[PDB]
Design a protein around this ligand. Sequence first.
Ligand SMILES: *[C@@H]1O[C@H](CO)[C@@H](O)[C@H](O)[C@H]1O
Length: 13
Amino acid sequence: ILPWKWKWTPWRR
Ligand SMILES: *[C@@H]1O[C@H](CO)[C@@H](O)[C@H](O)[C@H]1O
C-alpha cells in the first residue's frame, strides 16, 4: 500500500 497524500495532483512550481 502507498498513501501518496499530495492532494490528488502534486503542487509543483
Ligand atoms: C491537482 O491538479 C490540478 C489540475 O489542474 C491542479 O490545479 C492542482 O493544483 C493539483 O493539486
